[PDB]
Amino acid sequence: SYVRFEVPEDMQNEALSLLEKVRESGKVKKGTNETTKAVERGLAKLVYIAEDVDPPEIVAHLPLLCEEKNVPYIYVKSKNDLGRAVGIEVPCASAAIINEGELRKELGSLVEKIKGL
Amino acid sequence: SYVRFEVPEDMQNEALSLLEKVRESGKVKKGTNETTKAVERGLAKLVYIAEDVDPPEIVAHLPLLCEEKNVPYIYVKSKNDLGRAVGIEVPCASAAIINEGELRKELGSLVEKIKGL
Amino acid sequence: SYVRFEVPEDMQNEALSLLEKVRESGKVKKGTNETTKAVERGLAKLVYIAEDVDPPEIVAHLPLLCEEKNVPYIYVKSKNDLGRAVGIEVPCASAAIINEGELRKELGSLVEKIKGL
RNA sequence: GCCGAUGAAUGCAUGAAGC
RNA sequence: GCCGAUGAAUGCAUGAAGC
RNA sequence: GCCGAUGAAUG
RNA sequence: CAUGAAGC
Ligand code: NA
Ligand code: NA
Ligand code: NA
Ligand code: NA
């Protein structure tokens, strides 16, 4: 689909777990509208995009945009899992990390692992 | 009606305030069904009957039963107010106090005011 | 799956024919709830279990129990056919023969063919 | 939101009707 | 027509939840 | 319970 | 456009 590279589930789980952790020591935007706004304003440190989005055009612009902004993005399998990770009661098509908090190093590890694809 | 005497509203509010006060340090049975059971078993110390109960036949037996069991009963105007007094979320057609808790003396005063009719 | 032996469709049709014929001179329990109670009460002479039960935990306990109660059980293909055989309007997951009626000998032949498996 | 002491869930009995 | 033995109407125990 | 980040209430 | 978890 609108997917520009495959992502290992090891990495996926690493990322989602990091997203939960950032929620308490950092800042996160959740939902495509917020995330697009964040990337546009150049606040996004790592953006998450779910792969099971129907219709696709809802997240279709996000990979293209992140790459023009040279903002790292990473894909995850289910929007349900991303909804759970940002701490909401509904599925979440995309999200983003805006302020890392204390997790300077973990996020460094993860974004570096993402370039490797 | 099934009403055998009018009750000064002073007496009524004293009764209701008493009932909330008992809810937490003593024992109260709520609903016509539980109430009738308490009276039948000789456990009821004071029963409350709402006057606005329709159909009346739902609480009609309670006065007569109390009188053959020598249980003091008192009438109150609204079942809504009685529900609120026993701390349930719906109106309550009748209720009963089974264990006075610490509020022995006030209960004496109230039953005495009831005898006065 | 709860199926503990294969049953020849020859035997299955025999058993269902016997069940239709008894529902008229004997007694039959129909539906898992009733049938289980009948087995637990030690009244069941033969229990029928449909194989196409979804989810299986509805009838899964029945073999173990019949085994504890020394009750013969026999398996059949469809819950619809079992519903039809006990004479009801909906599919039937399990049933039991409680009183053989006139069919002492036939029910004996059938329980015998069942030991052979 | 709705529903519930004018009796919720539940338990036990029942077991083909209900709308 | 829909629904129902994968349990309808129901009786009783019970008493604050259920959706 | 239904609904809601595929965006609630709102401005 | 702004805001972003409630509303019923
Ligand atoms: Na035996
Ligand atoms: Na069929
Ligand atoms: Na029941
Ligand atoms: Na009932």
Residue numbers in the entry:
A (entry chain G), B (entry chain C), C (entry chain D): 1 to 117
What did the original publication write about this model?
We have solved the X-ray crystal structure of the complex of the A. fulgidus RNA bound to its cognate L7Ae protein. In the crystal lattice, three two-k-turn units adopted a triangular arrangement, with six L7Ae molecules bound to six k-turns. The overall structure of the complex is closely similar to that of other L7Ae complexes, such as those with Kt-7, box C/D, and U4 k-turns. The recognition helix makes the usual nonspecific interactions with the RNA (using the sidechains of K37 and R41) and specific hydrogen-bonding interactions with the G1b and G2n nucleobases of the tandem G:A base pairs (using E34 and N33, respectively). Thus the k-turn adopts the N3 conformation, and the A2b:G2n base pair is associated by two hydrogen bonds.
The L7Ae family of proteins selectively bind to a widespread structural motif in RNA called the kink turn (k-turn), which has recently been reviewed in depth. The k-turn is a motif found in duplex RNA comprising a short (usually 3 nt) bulge followed by tandem trans-sugar-Hoogsteen G:A base pairs. A recent study has shown that archaeal L7Ae binds to a putative k-turn structure in the 5′-leader of the mRNA of its structural gene to regulate translation.
